Design an enzyme around this catalytic site. Structure first.
Site, PDB file in Angstrom:
ATOM      1  N   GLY B  91       0.992  -1.312  -0.036  1.00 24.72           N
ATOM      2  CA  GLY B  91       0.052  -0.015   0.053  1.00 24.72           C
ATOM      3  C   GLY B  91       0.675   1.236   0.152  1.00 24.72           C
ATOM      4  O   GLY B  91       0.375   2.123   0.344  1.00 24.72           O
ATOM      5  N   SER B  93       2.100   4.768  -0.964  1.00 21.61           N
ATOM      6  CA  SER B  93       1.105   5.707  -1.368  1.00 21.61           C
ATOM      7  C   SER B  93       2.026   6.594  -2.271  1.00 21.61           C
ATOM      8  O   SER B  93       1.470   7.376  -2.983  1.00 21.61           O
ATOM      9  CB  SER B  93       0.493   6.192  -0.456  1.00 21.61           C
ATOM     10  OG  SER B  93       1.317   7.319   0.556  1.00 21.61           O
ATOM     11  N   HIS B  98       9.423   6.562   3.399  1.00 17.24           N
ATOM     12  CA  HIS B  98       8.577   7.194   4.373  1.00 17.24           C
ATOM     13  C   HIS B  98       8.143   6.557   5.665  1.00 17.24           C
ATOM     14  O   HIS B  98       7.711   5.277   5.308  1.00 17.24           O
ATOM     15  CB  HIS B  98       7.296   8.066   4.050  1.00 17.24           C
ATOM     16  CG  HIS B  98       6.279   7.375   3.294  1.00 17.24           C
ATOM     17  ND1 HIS B  98       6.422   7.021   2.048  1.00 17.24           N
ATOM     18  CD2 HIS B  98       5.033   7.223   3.440  1.00 17.24           C
ATOM     19  CE1 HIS B  98       5.255   6.342   1.548  1.00 17.24           C
ATOM     20  NE2 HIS B  98       4.343   6.646   2.656  1.00 17.24           N
TER      21      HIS B  98
END
Ligand SMILES: CNc1nc2c(ncn2[C@@H]2O[C@H](COC(=O)NCCc3c[nH]c4ccccc34)[C@@H](O)[C@H]2O)c2nccn12
EC number: 3.9.1.-
Lengths: 115, 112
Positions: B91, B93, B98
């Site tokens: 997932g 993004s 990060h």
């Protein structure tokens, strides 16, 4: 007893069995006994640190090594669609063993939010 | 290629910055999934954790030390969860590495 006497310390010293993926002088990677994805393993330091909130500044490279090892092991296990890495701190984080550990989960679509 | 996180580092678009040093930036997530939800990102453009270099290991650890210091400063004394997402199954993004830090509520299991 290096590694501490949490269950993870016992795994480090080969006192409790585990299914070990990778081992070096700094860490150990092994499959989780209660997997939450098709592939679910842990990377832990051999040095006992209870929780990330009490990690020393000079534990930076060690913590980074957990992540590098985590990503290498994920590649070696064929997690080609991706994966999620998780560190839990304390009660709100869902920490169940007070020896720092990186979860790596994959083999299915992970959802948002991450719990 | 550039990302929205590059724009944030370059101060071209607004973000609520929590901490900055010479090699990373911590800022509140625009789509928070907990009462406290912030990111710690390197200034170096590493697209995804799967392509991080060995030389990057202390930088990666620096993200988690900064994250845990920021969490303490933001009052997350009952705990928190740190997350790195890789690829579509993870997932992820934005294709700039990060570290998510979430707290202020009970985090559940499984972690998605
Ligand atoms: C791999 N072998 C092994 N693993 C264990 C054992 N005993 C727990 N482990 C594994 O270590 C992880 C610790 O997770 C957390 O500390 N937070 C993850 C989230 C979580 C765990 N427990 C919770 C309870 C409430 C809420 C959240 C959580 C879990 O995923 C366990 O399956 C154990 N004995 C003998 C051999 N064991």
């Amino acid at each position: 007893r290096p590694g501490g006497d949490t269950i993870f310390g016992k795994i480090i010293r080969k006192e409790i069995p585990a299914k070990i993926i990778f081992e070096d002088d700094r860490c150990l990677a092994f499959h989780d006994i209660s997997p939450q994805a098709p592939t679910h393993f842990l990377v832990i330091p051999k040095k006992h640190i209870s929780q990330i909130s009490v990690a020393e500044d000079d534990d930076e490279s060690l913590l980074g090594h957990l992540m590098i090892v985590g990503k290498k092991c994920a590649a070696d296990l064929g997690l080609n669609k991706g994966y999620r890495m998780v560190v839990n701190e304390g009660s709100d984080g869902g920490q169940s063993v007070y020896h720092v550990h990186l979860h790596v989960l994959g083999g299915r679509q992970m959802h948002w939010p991450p719990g």
